[PDB]
Symmetry: D2
Subunit: 389 residues, 4 copies
């Protein structure tokens, strides 16, 4: 029953880059109107905005409610954000279908948004420290990148699956360069032009327009790639090269009944045939998507070889390949235009982000079956099946 009317994301910006001082709900707003106008639908009629956000400290009350009211959504709608780490971005889009598919609502916007750049450092000083140094905790490292279960960064969870699947530094770096090259090819030709909405960086030295993914490294050689030190495990494997950095962006989708889109002349971007989510051992968290995807395909009714296009989050090359190897889809059909390693993440958005890449790329090549999938810190994964109407 449930279709994706419209789809949009901002361009993804570098850490402390273009959007360094741009608040998440602001990037949220932009994309909220974007999917409004591209479905041809008026915020007047939006029932609820569901935004995944991971790092919300300091942005004031309920940043879902701000991004919506800003982008025109009237007061009679409702707004709530949510968090599943990387999954947030896509799971919102699942959550949103469950609203229409239960009679509980007619029309929803969903996705996520994220300013890793605007994340505050923090301290609980209600008691007041009478004597001693204290740590100013960086919520982006803490709430965003740090396993609450072992003590190490995500980067180690990668190393445990590296050693597990025995993914060598030569192969891992090979994966990286591919994703840089792919995404740089994809960029030059306007293969991202469709889904992107420009964002207007309100300024004072003038206004400056952003409609390019500033994280893709042009010319990225297998050698520049091989001159790196392992960013975590000092003779482990994971480097900056073959691992996503820290970024900002948003991405959303307007959902409605197949019967409703029909009434309005809207030519949907797809229809959500199924979604799933599963949990695993936090030490090896990147193995989320394997169980996650296959749950989806049981619910969707498809077999793995039915898939025309995959967009599987390359959080870290190591786990990216772990998903690829084990599942065994046609590798040349995953991240055709590039993975996270090259475009970045912005966590809270990373899933609606790749949903955008997926969808517009289905639309443009007559692919009919696709699936977005991502891994999760804590040890989980999410998946979604999209079949084009």
């Amino acid at each position: 029953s449930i279709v994706i009317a419209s789809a949009a994301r901002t361009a993804v910006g570098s850490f402390n880059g273009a959007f360094a001082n741009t608040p998440a709900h602001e990037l949220g707003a932009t994309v909220i109107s974007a999917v409004l106008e591209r479905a041809g639908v008026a915020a007047g009629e939006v029932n609820e905005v569901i935004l995944g956000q991971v790092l919300p400290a300091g942005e004031g009350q309920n940043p879902a409610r701000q991004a919506a009211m800003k982008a025109g959504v009237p007061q009679e709608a409702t707004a709530w954000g949510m968090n599943q780490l990387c999954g947030s971005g896509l799971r919102a889009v699942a959550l949103g279908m469950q609203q229409i598919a239960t009679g509980d609502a007619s029309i929803i916007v969903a996705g996520g948004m994220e300013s890793m750049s605007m994340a505050p450092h923090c301290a609980h000083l209600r008691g007041g420290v009478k004597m001693g140094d204290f740590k100013m905790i960086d919520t982006m490292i803490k709430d965003g990148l740090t396993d609450a279960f072992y003590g190490y960064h995500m980067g180690t969870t990668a190393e445990n699956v590296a050693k597990q699947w025995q993914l060598s530094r030569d192969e891992q770096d090979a994966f990286a360069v591919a994703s840089q090259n792919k995404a740089e090819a994809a960029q030059k030709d306007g293969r991202f032009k469709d889904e992107i909405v420009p964002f207007i960086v309100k300024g004072r030295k003038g206004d400056i327009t952003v409609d390019a993914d500033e994280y893709i490294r042009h010319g990225a050689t297998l050698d520049s790639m091989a001159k790196l030190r392992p960013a975590f495990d000092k003779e482990g494997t994971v480097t900056a090269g073959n691992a996503s950095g820290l970024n900002d962006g948003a991405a959303a989708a307007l959902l409605m009944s197949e019967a409703e889109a029909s009434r309005r002349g809207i030519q949907p971007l797809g229809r959500i045939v199924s979604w799933a989510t599963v949990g695993v051992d936090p030490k090896v968290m990147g193995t989320g998507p394997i169980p996650a995807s296959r749950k989806a395909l049981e619910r969707a009714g498809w077999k793995i070889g039915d898939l025309d296009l995959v967009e599987a989050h390359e959080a870290f090359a190591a786990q990216a390949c772990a998903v690829n190897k084990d599942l065994g889809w046609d590798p040349s059909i995953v991240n055709v235009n590039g993975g996270a390693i090259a475009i970045g993440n912005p966590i809270g958005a990373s899933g609606a982000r790749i949903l955008n890449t997926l969808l517009f790329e289905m639309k443009r090549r007559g692919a009919r079956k696709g699936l977005a999938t991502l891994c999760i810190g804590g040890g989980m994964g999410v998946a979604m099946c999209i079949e084009s109407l």
Copy 2:
């Protein structure tokens, strides 16, 4: 169709009182373990833990997840947090209901959690602070009570309702007195012994058992009530003891299909018949419960008559009164055992907390159709109709 087999709520703590130094997820697990034990269900068979949480600042990746693990819920079940302010904790239950109702999960735990105590101060300190003074922001006040739509603390959006509803200082006081009598009474007669589930505050020179709501004051006399000068408006009428204060508390209810509960020989508290969330003019946020209720009642097919028991978020004297004056339910069945004023508030779990009381009162007095409803910052209501078997 879907029922609530069990529930449990921690006793609600005072601000920087009994749970002063306690991480909400650790209150979380306690409530989770509880709903299981009582109802007879084993950790493994839980699919997912959906938890409301407004001030997760600094706590670590997916705190819902951290609660989950700590209560025994296996590495496979999923967990996520979400936010719609005070309405998070009831709304989380509806989102639990929808997991069952669509084809996605057998057994969900839904609730909410909140440690107003551990809430940090913070500043954005990435691009450095070149030169000048800067502010450390209180995230409890920033992200919890400061509607980032006008400038001021919730307290005067309460004033904004009194103003039109002319609710004189003596009626605002007389509300509190009543609630504080009704609540303290309830407890004395033992009525919170059912809902609550003891928690352990793990001190150094000994452990501490908490299962008494420390916020409840005694001998609630109109006399003391009427001398607190206007807290929020320097020429106002909503005061600290007639606006719900800052509190710590977790609370939750276990969910499964009605057939599943019987298959499991588990004596449900009641059945989730309908729910509702609606928007209203943000300035006058307190009125959420007015439009939400109708819808819920309408969806349930009940007119107010059929309600034998009700709970409405006593956020303020200013907003709770108008609500009963508008909808026109009979007061004699609303917050019988007490409301936010006397019990406490605690954002992320308030809605879940009032879930518990309603259900446990329903059992031990013979109401068949209870309803709960809440106001939300930014202009929102959330509503649920409950039928017992």
Copy 3:
């Protein structure tokens, strides 16, 4: 030549005690007036104020000046601070002495002030930390109690002397209790009333007048002292019981020439016949007083044995004995009224605080030759010889 006409000091306050919210220049100011009053010189005849202060962060431009002004010193006069750690309050009396000596001033008020309670926490936030955690530093510990060369605490340099001069846990505790008991006594016999000037802690609910050193323990048992665990070297011998506290307080002297004193018919507290400062190995910093006092005595022309009364700074019991055995004066003329371990240790003021004790017990019993000496972090010591007139 140059002589001390009058003196005063405040009570010494405990850490976050009677002066917790009382800025140091406020304490210094009372002292300035006192020494003015007590001599019969008018605030307007003061040429310059010299005040050692070690923790001045947060306080404002030249707090020395602030005190001078609040005490009523004309703005035609000058005021500056200096920092030689513990020796500050006494070097200051010497620099003051130099002013008059060379004939570039006539009437100096000199001493020191400190508020260890009022120290702030800080961090250099201009460049900003792009990501990861930074510490908020205690300026008190950092700038006030810690050697930057070998990087350990000022407490550790006590373990050095402890190990090196072979002082038992017992005999250090003995010293501590001796110091307690002596002070305690001198308090009850009223021997501090003369040196001490009251201070009015202004209060929202009422003034409080502080007139007694509140750090001194009454009936302190050896048992109490002997059960504390070693405060720095967890495998050591120094503790919080035989180590001076963290204290607030000020103290000062009014200097002029001997000739000028006579014109005014002032009966001075004694004559500065010499001073000195030396350096020693930073690791055992407590040792300063050895060659300092040597230097000072030789400059004066005095055989150690000619001393009638001595004050030596008890940084820790460890250096205090070390200073004693090595120099060898009869310990029955040393710290006749207790020492820093009992009375307190307001860093900047300490060197003036002992000078006061010395000056007042000197006169009270009519001693001809006296010596004050302190030990200093970054391996130094300062000593001045006073003779009565």
Copy 4:
């Protein structure tokens, strides 16, 4: 009978510029070795180091001791810092001169050093912040630039001298340009070569040698000053332009007896013939240089017109005029090589920065009498007289 046998200064640095991350004492060290090695004196003969400094917060125990110990001054010699604001650097030379006069030392190294870039933000937190937001004070602004009595700026007191002395917006800007242009010439012709000592800013990606005052602006237009808006009082007369900025640096000079120099065969940069300091009205704080300069000259037995060369602090344009119109000397001989608006200032060190400039230009142009003078915040002033040998 006391002389300056050499001097040296680092290049003065831009705020957050060349030295943005150099601990002040590191700059001191360089200056120390420098004066030793330009005089034929070995660090081991140094008796004491006396270094002015206003913003040491965060820098750990006694920064001036760290400076001396890095420079190799023996641990047997002593060290202290001091704070009479802008006067610090020069007063320090005068105190160093005092120590020798009285026969308490043979060789002092005295001057100043400052690092406004490494000044920290801070707040007082032992009390306990119960709730609500709070400030993080900038110690530089709070502790270096703000008159503690009226609570405005050092730039606002500058507006006072404007009205009271009648200096138009355009009258002052031209003076500022004059300075800049005087200073751009002097640099180019290498007139700063003698005094400046290169400092190596040890760098992870290579070392970098700073050997030129980077604050100076080439091709200074009178326009670009005149363009500037009032920065201390919305509708005032002062601007960020005709006012001195914020800077890092250090400077010092080595002192000894005249006959001592004689033995050693040292051709001395000059002879201290006298000095003085005074206080003036705190609101016209910049008017300090007036009576100090006078009382200096009178002490030296000199007429203002006997002076061959003059260096007067350009803390602002406004005082600079005020001081020149009052004292009444040939302004052709004032700051002959530019002044502090263009060379920047760096409070603690300023005083010796001009001393260096005075001694070296006196030498190169064969001047036989000189004068150094600077205005002090809080309401003071220090001037010293030099006569060449």
